[PDB]
């Protein structure tokens, strides 16, 4: 109970990177892991300072007064702990790796202090060799997230010292799964308003917590996995989208906990996969994330000479719904170049 407020912050900077993310790419799909994001990049604060630290919390929602650095520090350390603790029947796995330059000069203090505090695995790697630490990288964080996530890293900048990946992976079986026998097998799903595509769509009919919002017009059901998570499909009515979007955030969502009621309902959802990629350097500069780029970059916290700044950030997650349950993945990259 004591990571609610952060995980409510973490929830709101999901939600304000998910607008930015409707207005780069309108009306398409979307898909990310907002956890991956916001832990990749709290890692990497932990060894900034000054504006560099200060600006990266702040991007990410945090409020210094309400909760010192120190805090948000060891707050996500507890999250991840607690997001990775085994439970039986969920596959849940939030890791990083550090991939640390033949001529870095990193704090062994940071080393430490990662690898026993944040999960880290660390590695050292020849990056004059560009192509083959490329390969190294993306075949980690492949291993990593099952096979899910394939070639995270499409290109690596040839000056690349270091890189930082954060990886996810989720695989839950739903509370009732769906019996492929009541699948059928080419249903209609409306793609825009005159244009529809066939899809596998699963059929049961269940008790589940569900509501309609009588102020966002927008249908709201809970489908719970087995074990310590849950999925919500938000389904607006013709012409909603946008608004229902705009009032995403922490707030709405605590209003629907309150208002959700477990009933019977004729379910009909479909079985499909899909992907998504994101290069998130310029974005993240917009959101506030401005020194960590720049010459002035303050990592005194990572290496004994200050020697690095970012220079690039990517994410890529997967996803696929069937009769079973849910399997989900995600990978966030960040690389640095001499400062």
Not at 80 to 99: H, M, V
Not at 114 to 134: G, M, P
Not at 249 to 267: A, C, E, H, Y
Not at 279 to 306: P, R, V
Request: charged share 20%.
């Amino acid at each position: 109970a004591t990571l609610y407020k952060m995980s409510s912050i973490n929830a709101d900077f999901a939600f304000n990177l998910y607008r930015r993310f409707t207005v780069e790419t309108p009306d398409k799909n979307i898909f990310f892991s907002p956890v991956s994001i916001s832990a990749a990049l709290v890692m990497l604060s932990f060894g900034a300072c000054c504006s560099t630290q200060t600006e990266i919390v702040e991007t990410l929602g945090f409020n210094l007064t309400d909760t010192p650095m120190v805090e948000i520090q060891h707050g996500f350390q507890h999250l991840i702990c607690s997001l990775n603790f085994p439970k039986k029947e969920l596959e849940l796995q939030i890791g990083n790796a550090l991939f640390i330059g033949k001529h870095l000069k990193p704090l062994a203090k940071f080393l430490n202090d990662v690898k026993t505090l944040y999960e880290t695995e660390v590695f050292s790697t020849d990056f004059s060799n560009i192509s083959a630490a490329k390969q190294e990288i993306n075949s980690h964080v492949e291993m990593q997230t099952k096979g899910k996530v394939v070639g995270l890293i499409q290109d690596l900048k040839p000056n690349t010292i270091m890189v930082l990946v954060n990886y996810i992976h989720f695989k839950a079986q739903w509370a009732n799964p769906f019996d492929p026998s009541k699948t059928e097998d080419s249903s209609s799903f409306l793609i825009d308003k005159t244009t529809t595509v066939q899809v596998p769509m699963m059929h049961q009919m269940e008790q589940y917590y569900h509501l309609v919002d009588m102020e966002l017009n927008c249908t709201v059901l809970q489908m719970d996995y087995s074990k310590n998570a849950l999925a919500l499909f938000v389904l607006p009515k013709e012409g909603q989208m946008e608004s229902v979007e705009a009032a995403m955030s922490s707030k709405t969502l605590k209003k629907w906990n309150r208002l959700l009621q477990k009933g019977w309902v004729d379910l009909f959802v479909p079985k499909f996969s899909i992907s998504a990629t994101y290069d998130l350097g310029a974005t993240l500069l917009k959101m506030g994330i401005q020194h960590a780029y720049s010459e002035n970059a303050d990592f005194s916290g990572l290496t004994e000479d200050n020697g690095l700044k970012l220079s690039n950030a990517a994410h890529k997650a997967v996803l696929h719904i069937g009769e079973k349950g849910t399997e989900a993945a995600g990978a966030m990259f960040l690389e640095a170049i001499p400062r």
